[PDB]
């Protein structure tokens, strides 16, 4: 009953490649018909769904989108319920706004027992990944919940002040990821550390230089940074938060294993049919999708499923279906939620265009094939970031996706919500 996570044995779905338009995505984000100009460009989205509780974060910039003053930083939490037609909807229950909107960047979310912990970064010099040699390093953590019990004390806004961050050998850590996992008394936020470039160990042998005659063998080393001549490289990983030990909890960092290592990017680890699956956004030469099963937690070993049918578009320098190393920190976030693990199938909103990001399509694909595709927008609609999270309805499976489509009705890149029903039977 209600909205639950993937735990157990759901209804069997179609296991055959079909293309007779078996998918029909609906929209659950009917926006107000704004008239005239907008000047309210929505950047930095966030969508984290866990145990029927969803979180949302977006920044409204006045004027342009890249260079625009911030107006309101909305951090919202809510429950996932039905829309009266067996279609899930996002009923946001609480909304908060920090005092300074131009200082909150790269938030996160996790739900352990009754709190939706939002882990953002405090920056007074600009963007964290853009300005790394001048960022302070302090992190912000807010305890948002559902049903704050108005006739009470501070159980609606409490912002936990982190004492100090204990880094093993890193300099600065920052939460870079929509959603993490919970393990009872330990929160795990997908984050990235700004490691010193002059103190990184990576032998120039593990680089995939099998058939890369046009490429250069020294491309793997100078690729984990935002720029070639950069002082801080992005090492993805997790932030462990022990809210059950000590008077005030602490934060530690655990890096990702060296197996198929890439640059730090918005990552997401999510539980499924038991174990957690980790996905790292392909913001590097590895245009192929990077996701796999997590074996261990402390050393963070994640086996990556080699998928060669789904890729990520670029900017005419590192297009889709590219494997050889190349210096290009250009990409978009396109996750893929694992549906069933008996046969590896993942559903995600990707971009079927080896060019500028256009034509978002919801693809449910197996290891190496394209099982089902759904076209939810015209081939001219532009996208910027796609987040997808699947869950269990009363008895079926439904996937909610936030897509940065070009709203033709308002002439602005607007985050819209879409609900996709997994086909139960091919017939």
């Amino acid at each position, epitope marked *: 009953e209600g909205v639950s996570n993937l735990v157990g044995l759901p209804n069997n779905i179609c296991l055959q490649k079909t293309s007779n338009q078996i998918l029909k995505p609906k929209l659950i984000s009917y926006t107000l018909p704004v008239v005239g100009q907008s000047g309210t460009c929505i950047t930095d989205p966030l969508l984290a769904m866990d145990e029927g509780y969803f979180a949302y974060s977006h920044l409204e910039r006045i004027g342009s989108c890249s260079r625009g003053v911030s107006k309101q930083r909305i951090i919202g939490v809510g429950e996932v319920l039905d829309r*009266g037609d067996e279609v899930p909807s*996002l009923f946001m229950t609480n*909304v908060w706004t920090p005092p300074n909107p131009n200082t909150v960047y790269h938030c996160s979310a996790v739900y352990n027992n009754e709190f939706y912990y939002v882990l953002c970064a405090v920056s007074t010099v600009g963007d964290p990944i853009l300005n790394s040699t001048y960022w302070s390093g302090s992190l912000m953590m807010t305890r948002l919940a559902v049903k704050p019990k108005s006739n009470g004390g501070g159980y609606n806004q409490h912002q936990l002040a982190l004492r100090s961050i204990e880094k093993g050998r890193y300099d600065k850590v920052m939460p870079y990821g929509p959603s993490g996992i919970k393990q009872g008394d330990t929160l795990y936020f997908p984050a990235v550390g700004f490691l010193v470039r002059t103190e990184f160990k990576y032998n120039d042998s593990n680089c995939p230089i099998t058939k890369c005659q046009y490429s250069k063998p020294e491309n793997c080393r100078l690729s984990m940074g935002i720029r070639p001549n950069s002082h801080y490289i992005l090492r993805s990983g997790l932030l462990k938060y022990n809210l059950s030990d000590g008077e005030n909890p602490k934060v530690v960092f655990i890096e990702i294993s060296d197996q198929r290592l890439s640059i730090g990017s918005p990552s997401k680890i999510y539980d499924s049919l038991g174990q957690p699956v980790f996905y790292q956004a392909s913001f590097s030469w590895d245009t192929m999708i990077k996701f796999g099963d997590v074996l261990t937690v402390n050393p963070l070993v994640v086996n990556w499923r080699n998928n060669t049918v789904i890729s990520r578009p670029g900017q005419s320098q590192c297009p889709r279906f590219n494997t050889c190393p190349e210096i290009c920190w250009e990409g978009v976030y396109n996750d893929a939620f694992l549906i069933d693990r008996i046969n590896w199938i993942s559903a995600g909103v990707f971009l079927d265009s080896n060019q500028t990001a256009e034509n978002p399509v919801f693809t449910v694909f197996k290891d190496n094939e394209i099982l089902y595709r759904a076209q939810l927008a015209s081939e001219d609609t532009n996208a910027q970031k796609t987040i997808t999270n699947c869950f269990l309805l009363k008895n079926k499976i439904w996937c909610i996706s936030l897509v940065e489509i070009y709203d033709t009705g308002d002439n602005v890149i607007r985050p819209k919500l879409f609900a996709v029903k997994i086909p139960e039977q091919c017939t």
Partner: nanobody, 119 residues
Framework: EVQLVESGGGLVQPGGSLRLSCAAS????????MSWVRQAPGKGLEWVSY????????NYADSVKGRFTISRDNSKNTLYLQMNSLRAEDTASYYC????????????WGQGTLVTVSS
């Protein structure tokens, strides 16, 4: 399908009262949020009141704490937004929609109602 009508008018003198009303057809009104949102000409969406199910929690949009008071009724589907001591900074349009605030819209918004504070 789903119908949400926003009645009421405007053209009021700064300082007074206003009794807004809402309509609901389709979905169940007793089990959903059905909050209010405000849209000023030239500005974006501004949340003014959020009501949950049977009275447990009510957020009154701290920016305007004591000027507004939202009320719900499960017997007759109608969401009241009785305003008290309005000002000239409240000239905008009100919409009773599912979901607290932001950019998320569950169902179709609808026509709405215009409220003007002048003279």
């Amino acid at each position: 399908e789903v119908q949400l009508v926003e009645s009421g008018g405007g053209l009021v003198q700064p300082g007074g009262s206003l009794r807004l009303s809402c309509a609901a057809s389709g979905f169940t009104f007793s089990s959903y949020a059905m909050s209010w949102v405000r849209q000023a000409p030239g500005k974006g969406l501004e949340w003014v009141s959020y009501i949950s199910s049977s009275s447990s929690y009510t957020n009154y949009a701290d920016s305007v704490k004591g000027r507004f008071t939202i009320s719900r009724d499960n017997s007759k589907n109608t969401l009241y937004l009785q305003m008290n001591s309005l000002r000239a900074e409240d000239t905008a349009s009100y919409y009773c929609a599912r979901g607290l605030a932001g950019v998320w819209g569950i169902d179709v918004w609808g026509q709405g109602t215009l409220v003007t504070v002048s003279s």
